[PDB]
Design a protein around this ligand. Structure first.
Ligand SMILES: CO[C@@H]1O[C@H](CO)[C@H](O)[C@H](O[C@]2(C(=O)O)C[C@H](O)[C@@H](NC(=O)CO)[C@H]([C@H](O)[C@H](O)CO)O2)[C@H]1O
Ligand SMILES: [Ca+2]
Ligand SMILES: [Ca+2]
Ligand SMILES: [Ca+2]
Ligand SMILES: [Ca+2]
Ligand SMILES: [Ca+2]
Ligand SMILES: [Ca+2]
Ligand SMILES: [Ca+2]
Ligand code: NA
Lengths: 198, 194
């Protein structure tokens, strides 16, 4: 008789960026070769993360969970754009637990996984734009600000389209990601005097 | 015999906007059907408008200035982008004179014309953008601002490409034209609660 519960393999470095879809996989096997279902929890309490999702595809099918072909459970979601990140950046995580049943009613003991989440600017590193030559460095014209925003946008296609690029009177660039975290580019790397570069 | 000066017809409403090229036409006619040349001046003195230019095409040719086909002098230019604008718009203008003469040497009197100039916002009237909903009216997100600018821009292709559209925390829209004059769109015609 089967008295042995399923065995679960967890990903070791799950990192998510606010507002951006992420995914990761659990791998599960059982000596019977069949896994019935799983439970995501907070150590036996409600999961408490309605944005976390996973497919029950191929659950409880003979052969779905062998050593050669493990049950691969795809977990995905989006950490909310405005999920709180406290002063200590490393507190930004959720520790949760997973267990699985086999077809014989053996349930594994909860093991932990940790979902770390960070601000979008941690993901993004803006390349400097091609220099925009201006008439007065301490007072850019509207067309000069537009050229800057265009140049920055052009130099960083990997940056999200929903990120907003602003430009100050002296050409300082602020890039504000959808989660309101920011990057900055100093004026002396964005604009130069036209008449001097003659 | 020709002892009669040519007749000059000036445009009644010449209105230019800073930084933007304008054009207008004088129409000139003479008995003889020929106009020799014209002169633009400040009531006889130098014109003092180096940014103004006019075409001397077909001057002093027989039949260039008849009542059926008058001499049409094309005038064009650009009023300087930073031309000072008096609080009293009545002084926001250049008053000048034109005279013309025929091949007989009959010179017309100095006829007045006036080039009024204005800030770029006097020309542009932005249409309302497609309404954009936001999660919080008093505090728009980066994405919601991006969509606002895009919506304003979309509904106003007439605005110069060089103009800059900014959006504030509450969705108030500011359009700043190349001459640094501005238009404003209030949040009521821009944003709403989702
Ligand atoms: C209830 O006690 C929990 O015990 C767990 C044992 O591993 C954890 O220590 C847990 O702490 C964290 C976590 O999930 O790891 C620590 C995080 O810094 C904290 N996150 C934040 O404050 C912001 O993301 C989380 C959350 O408070 C919690 O997971 C949400 O339910 O708790 C202990 O809370
Ligand atoms: Ca088993
Ligand atoms: Ca960054
Ligand atoms: Ca913009
Ligand atoms: Ca005549
Ligand atoms: Ca020519
Ligand atoms: Ca206007
Ligand atoms: Ca007007
Ligand atoms: Na003609």
């Amino acid at each position: 008789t089967d008295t042995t519960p399923p065995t679960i393999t967890v990903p070791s470095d799950i990192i998510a960026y606010r507002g951006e879809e992420f995914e990761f996989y659990f791998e599960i096997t059982d000596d019977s070769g069949q896994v019935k279902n799983i439970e995501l929890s907070t150590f036996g309490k409600p999961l408490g993360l309605n944005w976390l999702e996973y497919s029950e595809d191929n659950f409880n099918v003979p052969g779905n969970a062998t050593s050669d072909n493990p049950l691969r459970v795809r977990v995905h979601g989006t950490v909310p754009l405005n999920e709180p990140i406290p002063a200590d950046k490393n507190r930004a995580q959720f520790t949760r637990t997973i267990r699985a049943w086999d077809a014989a009613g053996n349930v594994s003991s909860n093991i932990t996984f940790v979902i770390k989440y960070r601000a979008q600017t941690d993901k993004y590193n803006p390349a400097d734009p091609t220099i925009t030559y201006v008439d007065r460095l301490s007072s850019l014209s509207p067309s000069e600000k537009n050229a800057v925003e265009a140049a920055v946008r052009a130099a960083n296609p990997q940056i999200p389209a929903a990120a907003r690029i602003t430009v100050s009177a002296n050409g300082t660039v602020t890039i504000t990601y959808p989660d309101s975290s920011t990057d900055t580019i100093t004026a002396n790397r964005v604009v130069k005097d036209l008449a001097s570069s003659r």
